[PDB]
Amino acid sequence: PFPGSVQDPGLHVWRVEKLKPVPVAQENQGVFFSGDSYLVLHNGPEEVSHLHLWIGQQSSRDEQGACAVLAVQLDDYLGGRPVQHREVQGNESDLFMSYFPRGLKYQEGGVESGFKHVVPNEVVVQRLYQVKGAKNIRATERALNWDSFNTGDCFILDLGQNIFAWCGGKSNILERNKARDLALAIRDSERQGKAQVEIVTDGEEPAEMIQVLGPKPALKEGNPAQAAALYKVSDATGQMNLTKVADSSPFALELLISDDCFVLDNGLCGKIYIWKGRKANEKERQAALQVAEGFISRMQYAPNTQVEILPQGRESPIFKQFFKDW
C-alpha cells in the first residue's frame, strides 16, 4: 500500500510506522527515530534506483523484518529493479550518507516531532431562557437576541460568571420570584456556587446585558420546520464564549461581527457553516470548528454532514439565508 508516486525521481523515505510505511515530511528527512526502521529510495532521471532499508539501533529485531518485507512489496511495484541495501545505524553506507548533506541525526526515545500539548480550554456558553409557568416552572432556551424578550415575561441570562433575571415590565411579582429562584439555582448547582446573580427590571439593564445583546430597542407584548441556528464565537470578552445569536431562519445580517467567527448550524438538512470575519482571530477559528463538532455530536447529526468554512466577503450564495439578500 505505497503512494504510487514512488516512481518520480528524487528521494523517498518512509519511517516504517507499524505495518504501514509513513513518508517523512521533506524537512524531517535526515533524522531517523532510532526505535523504528525506515525505507529510503533514491532514483535518478536515467540513473539506477537503490532502495535501502534503514534499521535503527533500537529498532526491533522484528520491526526490521516487517520493514524488509515492505522493502520487497516495494521492490515489486518497481519489480526487482531497485537495488537493496541493509543500512544499520552507526555503520551506514558511504552511499546512504550520499543522500544527506549536513548529516544524520539519529534521535532516541522522546516524543514524535510536531508533538503538541493539547490544552482543553473550556468555553462559556451564554444562554438565555424564557421562564414561564404559573404553577410549574419551565425555563426554555431562547436565542440571546432582544428579538426574544417580551414585556410580560421574565428571562434568565446565563452569561457564565454572572446570571440575570431580567423582568418584563408588565409581568408579575410572582413571575419575578420564580425567575430569581430558578436562576438562583443555576448559580448554586451548575455554577456550584461561584457566580453572581442580579434581578433586573425591564429598562434598568446593566452594562453587561447591553454588552451582549447590544442596544435595547422596543419590546413586544406577546400574542400571534427550519432548524437553522446562528451562533457566535468570540474571546473578545477576554474569554471564549459561545452565544446563540439567532434561531428563526431569515437571519438579520447585522447579526454578524467582522471581529468574530460564527457558525451557521444547518446539519439537520445538510451542512454546517463556519463564517470567519477579517478581524476574527485564530482561537476563534480553531474554536468555531470545534463547536461545529459538538453540534453534529450532541444533536447526533448525520455522519457525513459537511462543515464548510466561508471567509468574509467570499460567502457562498447558499450561506446567504439571511433576510434581505445578502
Ligand SMILES: [Eu+3]
Ligand atoms: Eu519500534
Ligand SMILES: [Eu+3]
Ligand atoms: Eu474577536
